[PDB]
């Protein structure tokens, strides 16, 4: 069922990144013939890191946003449009309201909303 | 990260660049280089370079390309200073005058010496401008072609046709400005605003470097079959009329759409293009997502290494 | 660098498992010629689920423990022994002193300690 | 969650089962079946089955296998009940007497009729017991092989080799009890307390089902080369002397060790086994981690479908 999930990684920054890679890599290969959309990921996730992480370069869309509020609206929109099987956000803080908003948007697009928190 | 600089040379080049600065065309530094000091005052570009203060004394080249060349030769040093640090340079000018056709090749030489990827996007005069300018333009395009990695020569004549009755002196040159901006933006957005991670600067260089003559076509569509419509439109764009895609060594494709771009649409574009390109041609399809764009899907195709 | 890391997953239990699978699958294939040791994972992580999850069957050890206190102790011992490149735990709550113990054991065994909160 | 039941039949069978219930054989239910009513009093096994109260009147058999068989035929129903629900049953007995040699085959028939995987673990009499008992044992074993999936045979004669100077009457049968316990423990542990996920009940059923005669060897070692030493020791165990490992259809290996078991040690045992197993054999190497075990490493090898 399309919904909201949240993944948190704590530890050394390098460890958090290497633990993230397999999930993003896996997601980029999803059977659902749609995009893996990443929204306003941290500066650490450069296009080079993403390519080195072995993600499927033909099935990923990376969008930017000026701030959390913008990333939140952009995330719901990408989910809403239903062109991505998964929309990955890097929002923190994230309120129960924002989570509901993301969840609703995900249902409308028959997609998955995944928020990631590093630290 | 890649430093991209755009230099408009001469009157027409200055207008083209000023248009670029007031429209989209993000992620690039704009510079107007001219011998006419008066034309360098009321413009939008933040950087200006008055060519040959000693030769023209700031009065322009008087439409004599030799004067344009001598002015550029005088400031070969200031030109290198302006280009310093660039990873890519777009040189745009209206061929046919004195400053642009005379100075552009010299600026290109300096860029070439510094090892900077150089792409020139210039126009050939409208026939209503006369045989003199057209002749001057032809000679200049030959000189320019010897010092740039890729050279897009836009024949204004085609634009006058594309305008039909809306064609006016002002509208015609505005159309040229707009087409020039489309060339720069189409290529630079792939470098500065890629939405995907499959095409990097190195890829663009492969398509652009030491390629030679090039040309581009643009198309746009909305609705259910926009992917095919926009791509076909870009290929049948009169600017690519007498151009055999199968003969092009390189093909750079810019897809620009909003968040509604589907994975299927991105695939259709590449399908249609691989259909026209040769198996030996280097094809790069970049994707630029405009966060607040909707329904419309733009496709720009730049064929490099023509012939 | 040997250390303690923590991964937390919030959402439908089925979603959490699906997201976790790729990590465990890759961990089971680590180049380091040592075990991937799982300490008292939740009942949902049956041997069947781990097999169907695609993990390398020949490079994983799964050790059970009666409760959190025991699982914490077994995790540190496993880490300390140095026979695993990674020792995965599923401990919640986890005290500051507890994380300290885990990170010390990891360093001693030159291994990685990973706690998972579902 | 497999339900494993262990039924000890007769005097020797009961002693082995009661020894198992007192040592380290977890995850299984123990049952003692005997015609001798006094032997079933105050014992470790939680369940007892007094065979043929009408044929023997609780007085036991008189080393007469026919009495054992008739008592079992009388209680086929009660044998069914005690076995109801098992996914696997181990039938252990000392062949050569009356109850064990006579009733075991019948108990096996019932288990088989019920579709329960059945493994018999029995001993052949010591040479000092006489030709008569060895003959009776051989006959009972032949009758047993007709209804068990795997029939593990432990020739007591071999126990004397293992014991050597430490042999005595009490020690000889004590050794028999312990070996029988090792057989049940080695297999049951792979099913009930596996440390790895590569061997499931189905895999065990595959190496045990419809295989016929079987034999086992055990070994243990400590130190730097413990993996190879324990494995080679199991292979050369006198209980596996007269077997062509390469001629066995099934090979079940139990590796028992503490958390200090290294990946390399695991691969070492596997490699050694593959070198002795035939390429047409089903080989399953299950691992059991005893959280409180250290330095020692045990290897149990069960070769099924011999010949
Ligand atoms: N894009 C563009 N081209 C122009 C414009 N005005 C003139 N041109 C073209 O550029 C050529 C050069 O003229 P001009 O720029 O005045 O010459 P220069 O400054 O002496 O090099 C002409 O022959 C025209 O075809 C304009 O506003 N925009
Ligand atoms: N494991 C084990 N076997 C025994 C023991 N005592 C006798 N046996 C063996 O089992 C055989 C059966 O003897 P017994 O158990 O007295 O027979 P039953 O009660 O009539 O079936 C003997 O021939 C011995 O080899 C014992 O204490 N333990």
UniProtKB/Swiss-Prot annotation, chains B, D:
Self-association and partners: Homodimer. Polymerizes to form a dynamic ring structure in a strictly GTP-dependent manner. Interacts directly with several other division proteins. Interacts with the SulA inhibitor.
- Annotated GTP binding lies at 11-15, 98-100, 129, 133, 177
- Keyword Cell cycle in annotation: yes
Q: Cite any additional comment in the entry.
A: Formation of the FtsZ ring is inhibited by SulA.
Top-level taxon of origin:
Bacteria
Cite a single GO BP annotation: division septum assembly
Which cellular components does GO assign to this protein?
cell division site; cytoplasm
Which species does this protein come from? Pseudomonas aeruginosa (strain ATCC 15692 / DSM 22644 / CIP 104116 / JCM 14847 / LMG 12228 / 1C / PRS 101 / PAO1)
Q: What protein am I looking at?
A: Cell division protein FtsZ
Summarize the protein's role: Essential cell division protein that forms a contractile ring structure (Z ring) at the future cell division site. The regulation of the ring assembly controls the timing and the location of cell division. One of the functions of the FtsZ ring is to recruit other cell division proteins to the septum to produce a new cell wall between the dividing cells. Binds GTP and shows GTPase activity.
A single Gene Ontology molecular function, please?
A: GTP binding
> Family per UniProt?
Belongs to the FtsZ family.
Keywords for the protein's UniProt record, in alphabetical order:
Cell cycle, Cell division, Cytoplasm, GTP-binding, Nucleotide-binding, Septation
Q: Where in the cell is it found?
A: Cytoplasm
Curated annotation (Swiss-Prot), chain C:
The UniProt record describes its induction as: By DNA damage, as part of the SOS response.
| Modification note | Is rapidly cleaved and degraded by the Lon protease once DNA damage is repaired.
GO BP annotations of the record are: division septum assembly; DNA repair; negative regulation of cell division; SOS response
Signal peptide span = none
Indicate yes or no for the key word Acetylation.
Answer: no
Region (FtsZ binding) spans which residues?
57-62, 64-66, 78-83
Q: How does it assemble?
A: Homodimer. Interacts with FtsZ.
Protein known as: Cell division inhibitor SulA
Q: What gene does this protein come from?
A: sulA
Q: Which residues of the full protein are shown?
A: 43 to 160 of 161
